[PDB]
From TrEMBL:
Domain of life: Bacteria
Full-protein positions shown: 98 to 238 of 379
Name this polypeptide is given: CRISPR-associated protein Cmr3
Organism: Bacteroides fragilis
Length: 132
RNA sequence: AUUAAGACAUUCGUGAGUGAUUUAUUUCCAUGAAGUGGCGU
């Protein structure tokens, strides 16, 4: 009976529980302009041997792509009635590392080798998962 | 039935070993067992 499942969504539920904000990962090109100048014979990238035009990139605010300041991969985004709201992944997900062992019950087992660390994630109080 | 299920950060472990409340310090300084005779003219 299952026919169609939507991609899992990150939904924010506010105190005024009448509207929900859907959060998406920030596009990797956000805040930057990519042109691909086509004057030809200028410069061609070879991605593992395939022809491709050169990706001229500028911030949408010139200078070039400074990968020392590139941080779009750390941000999640949602629609606002203005610009795009950027939320850090830190502010959404809380992470803790848990140490675990199996208590050595003697008269048996070669299991001193039971020793591990696990990562557990907690969602912020206003954030839930959803899909259709 | 879903990179899933099971799993104590637990076992052993003396805040203990050595250590003088001891060293230095005069119950001492000053000081008269002294003073006076009386009456019988």
């Amino acid at each position: 009976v299952i026919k169609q499942i939507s991609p899992l969504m990150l939904i924010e539920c506010k105190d005024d529980t009448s509207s929900r904000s859907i959060y998406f990962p920030l596009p990797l090109d956000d805040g930057y302009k990519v042109s691909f100048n086509e004057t030809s014979n200028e410069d061609k990238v070879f991605y593992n041997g395939i022809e491709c035009p050169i990706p001229n990139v500028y911030p949408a605010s010139r200078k070039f792509f400074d990968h020392k300041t590139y941080n779009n991969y750390l941000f999640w985004c949602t629609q606002g009635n203005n610009q795009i709201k950027k939320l850090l992944s830190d502010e959404i997900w809380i992470s803790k590392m848990q140490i675990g062992i199996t208590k050595h019950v003697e008269e048996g087992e070669d299991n001193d080798k039971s020793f591990y660390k696990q990562e557990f994630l907690q969602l912020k109080k206003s954030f839930i998962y959803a899909f259709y």
